[PDB]
């Protein structure tokens, strides 16, 4: 998963109107570098997540959150919760009607439900 | 706080009222409001009903403060997207309009996160014996 995130990177690493449209640009690319940075930190926070675990069901787990769902906003997930997001991927995967339940109804509220999914949670 | 449930509940109610190919969008547009306007309206009332759960003096009062503070709507949504935990967090929101401003600088998913966080934080768990 992380070198499909850093094929992101990858591609990154390879008058008045104009300049706000050209400014505006700027911002944008700053935007998706910024981002893109998240999603290798994510990625290395999934993967600090992965080798502190060496653990290929939660991997399957996240298999099956995965199938459910598209990997950049999962990482985006992964961005905001990164000492939990192995964990958060653990319950919803445990939980195959969970995550499906979160992408049904409220999604806003859903990801808002994560951290509490991020929460009574007790570890092991 | 009961006499400003009726303030937002009256905007809605009025549209409630019904005083607004193309039918179509007619349609969607009304159903669409619909909806909307009835979950404003659970929430008008739970927004001040749960308030005067809570009954800390000011509420409306920060109501104010909030709603200064923000496009209505957001707040709403936010009702919308939190039950009692809302109008608390509203309450918080008069808490903290700096903080709040930093919640609303905060970009959407993060917002979630000003929202969520606080949420909990913003709570009773209770005790035992």
């Known amino acids: 998963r992380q070198r499909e995130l850093e094929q992101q990177m990858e591609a990154v690493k390879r008058q008045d109107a104009r300049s706000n449209a050209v400014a505006e640009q700027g911002r944008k690319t700053q935007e998706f570098t910024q981002?893109?940075?998240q999603y290798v930190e994510a990625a290395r926070k999934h993967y600090d997540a992965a080798e502190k675990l060496n653990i290929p069901d939660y991997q399957?787990?996240?298999?099956?959150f995965m199938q459910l769902v598209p990997?950049?906003?999962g990482a985006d997930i992964m961005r905001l919760f990164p000492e939990k997001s192995?964990?958060?991927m653990?319950?919803?995967?445990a939980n195959p009607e969970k995550a499906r339940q979160?992408?049904?109804m409220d999604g806003q509220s859903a990801l808002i439900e994560l951290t509490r999914l991020?929460?009574?949670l007790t570890l092991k």
Do not use: F, M, N, T
């Open 102 to 104: 979160l992408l049904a």
């Open 86 to 88: 192995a964990a958060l």
């Open 60 to 64: 399957e787990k996240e298999d099956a």
């Open 35 to 37: 981002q893109s940075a």
């Open 118 to 120: 991020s929460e009574r």
């Open 90 to 93: 653990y319950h919803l995967g």
């Open 71 to 73: 990997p950049a906003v």
